[PDB]
Structures are given as C-alpha cells and as structure tokens.
Design a protein around this ligand. Structure first.
Ligand SMILES: Nc1ncnc2c1ncn2[C@@H]1O[C@H](COP(=O)(O)OP(=O)(O)OP(=O)(O)O)[C@@H](O)[C@H]1O
Ligand SMILES: Nc1ncnc2c1ncn2[C@@H]1O[C@H](COP(=O)(O)OP(=O)(O)OP(=O)(O)O)[C@@H](O)[C@H]1O
Ligand SMILES: [Mn+2]
Ligand SMILES: [Mn+2]
Ligand SMILES: [Mn+2]
Ligand SMILES: [Mn+2]
Ligand SMILES: [Zn+2]
Ligand SMILES: [Zn+2]
Lengths: 348, 356
DNA sequence: ATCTGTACATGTACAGAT
DNA sequence: ATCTGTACATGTACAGAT
DNA sequence: ATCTGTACATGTACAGAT
DNA sequence: ATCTGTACATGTACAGAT
C-alpha cells in the first residue's frame, strides 16, 4: 500500500508528457534533418528512440530522453579489444576517420553544436562533453529542464559478435523463436568515450542493445497477453520503477554512489525476469515481495561483486576495475538500511 | 494411449518426406521460373508455401502439398459480392499486364486462371524428369493441381492469388478473435500483413460467376499453427508441449477416414475441422487446457464442439464472422445429420475407424 | 567500369530417428 | 537423451546487364 | 527518395461501480 | 480501497503518393 502510493508519485503526468515531447521532437527532428540535408559524413542516419521514456519506465518527470542516430555501414570487421567482450576496434564517406570513435564523434558533435546555435524558438544548449559518454547531450528549458542524449551508433547487419553467443538467455522466458528473431536484427556500436589514459581508448566502440532492450521492455511476458487489454497486469515495470527510484534517491544523497547508474538496476532486473519467468510470479498483488526479492537479488550482486552484461555475459559491470569494492559495500549498507526500515527515503 | 498409437500411425516418415520434398521442390521451382519469363502476365509472382504440410499437421503420408503463387496488385478496389463477406469483385482505377483479363474495369478470375493454367500445362509437358501431369479442372477450385507419380502419388495444388497490401476488408474487422489467446500485438501485426484473393471459379451458373474472387488467409493460418500458444515457449525446446496440433491431426483423420468410405460426406473438407479448432483454441486459450496428458478429453471436447456446429448448422469462418460454412445453402441438414451420427458412433464405440 | 535480380550462405526451430 | 533433414528468414556475391 | 495517413499499441485521467 | 469503461495523448510500423 506504501508502494502503491510511491508509484502514484513517480507517475508522469499527461500534460508534462505532451509539453516535453512536443519540444523534444522539435529539436530532434531539426538535428535529424541537418544530418542528411547536407553532404555530411552521416547522410543516411536514421533515428531510433531508446531508453526509459520510450520503454515507459521513466519516473518522476519526462526530463531525460535518449535518441540513437544509427548509421548503416557495410562490410566492417570487428576486433575484440583485449577480451573485454563489449569493446571493439572497427576496420574496413567516413574515410576522414581504422574507424576512430573519437574522430567521428567530434565531427558529429560539431554539427549538432552548429544547429543548436541556429535554434531561435527553443532555449536549448549543448552540455559540456563528458568523458565516458558516447552522447551529445542537449539541455532544454521550457522552463522545465529536459536533457537529450543524441547517441551516435554504427549499425551492422551480420551475425552478432561471438562474445554475445551465450547472451540474451530468454529461452525459457520469451523463448527460442523470439531469441532467434531478435538476433536476426542488426547490432550497434557506440563510442567508448573514456579518458582513463589506458591503451586504444580513443578508437574503441562499445556494443549497444538498446533496441533489443526496448522490445523486451514492451514484450516482457511469458504469455503473449501480459499487460495487454485482454490480458492481466504484471508488476514487472513497476518493480523496475521502484528500484530505479531507490537508486536515484540514494545517488542524490551520496556522492559515494556516483559510479552507479540506472543501467545497473536495468541489468539486474533482466536477470530477475529470466530467473522468474512466469507472469504469475509478478502478480500485482505481490508487488511488495517482488520488489523485495529484487532488492535481495541486487544485494547478492553487490555482495559477490558480480552483475554480468545481460547481452555480453563475460563483461562484469561490477568488476573491481569499474566500481570499487568500497563503493559496493557503501551501497549495500544503504539499501539494507532502507529495506529494514520501510524505505524512509521514499518519503521525500 | 489408444490415441497415442493412432498418432504414431499418422506420423510422417522422414524418408518419405525427403523423397517427396525433393521432387516437389524441383517441379515448383521450375514452374515458378517460367512465370518470370517473357511478357508472361504473371511475372513477379512469388511463392508462399501453405497448408497442412508446412504447418506440420499433414498426416498419414506426405502426398499433398499446397503452394501459393501470389501476385501483388496495387491500387485495387473491391466490391463485396452481395454482402457474402468472403467473395469480391476486383476493379481497377486506371487504363497493365492484366489488361487481357479486364472487363468493365473488372478483373476476370476465370480468364486469368485459364492463362495461368495454360502456362503451367505447357511447362509441365516439358518436364521429362518426373511422371507429372495436370489434373482435370475441378469446379470451385482456385488451384492448378499436379499429380506426381514419384512412384508414389503426390498432389500439389498451385494456387493463384492476388496480393493487396492495404487494410483488410471491413468484413474481417470482427474476425480473428485472438485477443485473449495470442493477444492484441499479434493481432495488430497479423492484420498489417497482406491479404489475398483467389478465384472462386464456381460454374454454378450464378451472375458474376467468372469474376468473383474469394479471400484467403492461408498465410495467417500458417503463422497461427506454428505460434499457437498463449505462452511464447509453447512446444519449444525450453517450454512445455501442448497437444493442440495432435488434436487437429486426430480430427483431420476421423474426417478423412469417413470421407474415404461414405460419399455423403462430399461437401465436407478438412478446412471445416481446421476452422472448428481455431474456435476451440480461442474458447480455451490456456496452454494448460491442452496438456498432452489430457489428449483424450481435448479430442473429446473438440468432437463435442464440432457436433454442436453440425446440429445447429453454424460454423463461422474464423476470419469472416458473417460467413457460415455450415449454412443450409452450402450443406443440407441431411448431410450434417449423417456426419453427426457417424461422429457420435465413432465417439461412443472406441473409434473403430482408427483401426482401418 | 558500376549495377543488380538471382541465388548461394548462414543459422536454427521443428520434429522425425536413433 | 541426442542427432539430423527440411523449411525458412535474412545477408551477400556475382554473372550478365546497363 | 521523402513524407503524410492510418491503425492501434503504450500510456495518463477520472467518474461510476464494486 | 480497487475495477471498469471512456476519454485524451504520444509513439511507431508501414502503405502509398509524390
Ligand atoms: N553502461 C551501459 N552499457 C550499455 N548500454 C547502456 C549503458 N548505459 C546506458 N545504456 C543504454 O542507453 C539507454 C539510455 O540510458 P540512460 O542512462 O538514459 O538510462 P535509461 O535506461 O534510459 O533510464 P533513466 O534515464 O530513466 O535512468 C539504456 O536504456 C541502455 O539501452
Ligand atoms: N474452403 C476453404 N475456404 C478457405 N480457405 C480454404 C478452404 N479450403 C482450403 N483453404 C485454405 O487452403 C489451405 C490448403 O487446403 P487443403 O484443402 O489442401 O487442406 P490443408 O489444410 O492443407 O490440409 P490437408 O491437405 O492435409 O487435408 C488450407 O490450409 C486453408 O488455408
Ligand atoms: Mn533515459
Ligand atoms: Mn541518457
Ligand atoms: Mn493440403
Ligand atoms: Mn489442397
Ligand atoms: Zn506485464
Ligand atoms: Zn504447443
């Protein structure tokens, strides 16, 4: 009953959705026109909306949108970077850029920046570049703050890379036929934009499966009718919203959690949805225990420092390399607290 | 257990499948290629395998294959034929390799099927690989049937079909009621696929005889047959087996055995049983209502449902609700009471016709 | 020289065979 | 149990055409 | 090629019923 | 308290026109 009340808070408002979407769509369509309405290196880029807002798991406000500008590029050879699973060198218009992610991202970025300068009807700027982000991030005020991540992606139509061969383990949940079809779709690569000082960092790209995650989010039941008008409701998305909320509220309070992101929560719940495939295990009457066993799953990842990429199982998002052991223990204490106290942080 | 053994008798042998498919694909692919020659009016037709063999509900032997030779026709107007829901006049909007089959803008089924058949016939006359001839034309059939003596006899229906990519006709708006079974996203995607028209070709003498076309949903039925569960994993390697197709096979076989003996049953065809079980699958959506352990009672309820259709003279087309395949104008009560009595007798006596 | 309809190439669910 | 032939979806090569 | 038109999925919002 | 039915809204796939 508590959680019902929290989920009412987190719910987006129809007016808010309409006002933010109409302004976001204005800007994106404009950047999009430019990318081909010019002999630029990215003519033929197409738009693909991704992330929480388009998955309908955005919470609180419609203030963050993700758009992929995917560029179909033929006959490319991947090279796995030092067995990371998820990072690759790319080889063979674009010959102004081995295809360097740094080089291509910044011309891409230069074009956006120029169009934003010529937008006089919307208050929009380009956020200062962040290392680690494959994005160009727009900041819009109308007057509400909305940020848009414009993600550059290459699109390849061959077999998925070998490191994914054992990924996407939906066989007992969404099944083999959905899995085969999903793997017939293209796969995508985005810039790994670290500044860490390590080796081929500048030319590395990372795999993206945002398009596969979108289908899963909107086709998430074992029954075809799950969450449809002639089916039952499940509380799978509500659990994702609640667990996202918990991590958001925690990161607001604690700088020690800067190394965590929503994608960790998302990865965790894909694993939970695979471990517990039956729609009846996510009955809306069992929201509380569903949320709890999610919390317990998330804590078990922290405890064992193990949260494998749902699509690239050798890639540990919780390795010591990326997140310090101290950071995970901090987060375990705070979650264990919120859990055993009826979630005080949910009341603010 | 008794029905388990009938299924084994009905099971196709991989060796038979291999030999029959090898011949069949040879002929079909050669026919499909002639269609692509010359100023052949049918240039651009594409192949669509449909029917029981490609749904894996073909029984006893692999001796009848159905293939659609479909031709996309854009900018099509339809006129429903006398509110029957399923039959249409095809008209065009301009003044086209189908020119030779036009009347008053009206596209002739009987004309265009004749040319299609003449081309097949000629192409077959050439085949000296295989003992293959073209059957005498059957009234009411949209097909050009090949009889292959492969030693073993093998029928192939080459079905001529127009392909329109627009929305399906209003007469189907209330059809295909899979919302509580396969759901709304599947229904929306299925109805985004093309719809098809095949020649009615009746020769009954009624007005418009040779220009009426009949809707076809073979392509939708193939999808349904192979994605038949409320659960995405139904019959998959990491899911539970159902007995949905097993019930279809047993019903098909009961109608086949009877049809083989008694010619009173000539108005009946396997599409009747196919349509009846789509309704049963809708009525009983859950995969647990089709547990392999309960094959006996699933087959029983399908028989009881079919019996009620026969008595009440009512079996609605699954895609065209207002079209009644068991109407008095199509099959007389006397033919349905005869089949009713034969089904009750097989039911209540241990299905002795399964032993013949 | 480049273009492109045809057909090989690849991968796997389905279900028969062992 | 695993092995395995057919059908089928989609990616790609290239002889013959422009 | 680009773009509008169409259908209906996913939502939110609220009154009346249970 | 929740459930149901209608209204209101945005996103998305694709046919078809220009
Ligand atoms: N580390 C990552 N690895 C792979 N994909 C990622 C990663 N981070 C984000 N993504 C992809 O980009 C999408 C957008 O990420 P983002 O940070 O905006 O969060 P989100 O899932 O959209 O939700 P929210 O913005 O509400 O926190 C993700 O849904 C996922 O598809
Ligand atoms: N009377 C009909 N009305 C509508 N569609 C029909 C009709 N008869 C056949 N069809 C369609 O054509 C297909 C082929 O028909 P056919 O009579 O060969 O039977 P089948 O369903 O393939 O099975 P079997 O040949 O094993 O008896 C059917 O699956 C169905 O889609
Ligand atoms: Mn987001
Ligand atoms: Mn983002
Ligand atoms: Mn058949
Ligand atoms: Mn047939
Ligand atoms: Zn659901
Ligand atoms: Zn099944």
């Amino acid at each position: 009953d508590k959680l019902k009340k929290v989920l009412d808070k987190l719910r987006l408002k129809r007016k808010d959705i309409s006002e933010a979407a109409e302004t976001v769509n204005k800007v994106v369509e404009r950047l999009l026109r430019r990318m081909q309405k010019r002999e630029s290196e990215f003519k033929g880029v197409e738009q693909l909306n991704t992330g929480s807002y388009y998955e309908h798991v955005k919470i609180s406000a419609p203030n963050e949108f993700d758009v992929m500008f995917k560029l179909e590029v033929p006959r490319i050879e991947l090279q796995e970077y030092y067995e990371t699973g998820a990072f690759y060198l790319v080889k063979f218009p674009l010959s102004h850029f081995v295809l360097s992610a740094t080089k291509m991202l910044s011309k891409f970025r230069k074009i956006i920046k120029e169009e934003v300068k010529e937008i006089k009807d919307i208050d929009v700027s380009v956020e200062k570049e962040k290392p680690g982000s494959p994005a160009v991030t727009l900041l819009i005020r109308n007057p509400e703050e909305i940020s848009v991540d414009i993600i550059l992606a290459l699109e390849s139509k061959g077999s998925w890379p070998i490191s994914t061969k054992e990924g996407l383990p939906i066989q007992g949940w969404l099944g083999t036929k959905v899995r085969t079809n999903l793997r017939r779709e293209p796969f995508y690569l985005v810039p790994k934009n670290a500044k860490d000082g390590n080796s081929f960092q500048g030319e590395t790209w990372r795999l993206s499966f945002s398009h596969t995650e979108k289908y899963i989010l909107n086709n998430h039941g074992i029954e075809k009718t799950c969450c449809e008008s002639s089916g039952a409701k499940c509380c799978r998305k509500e659990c994702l919203k609640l667990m996202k909320y918990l991590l958001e509220q925690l990161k607001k309070e604690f700088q020690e959690l800067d190394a965590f992101c929503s994608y960790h929560v998302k990865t965790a719940i894909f694993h939970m949805w695979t471990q517990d495939p039956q729609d009846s295990q996510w009955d809306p009457r069992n929201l509380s225990s569903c949320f709890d066993k999610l919390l317990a799953f998330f804590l078990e990842c922290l405890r064992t420092e193990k949260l494998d990429h749902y699509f690239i199982p050798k890639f540990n998002l919780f390795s010591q390399e990326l997140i310090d052991r101290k950071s995970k223990e901090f987060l375990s204490k705070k979650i264990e607290y919120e859990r055993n106290n009826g979630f005080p942080i949910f009341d603010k």
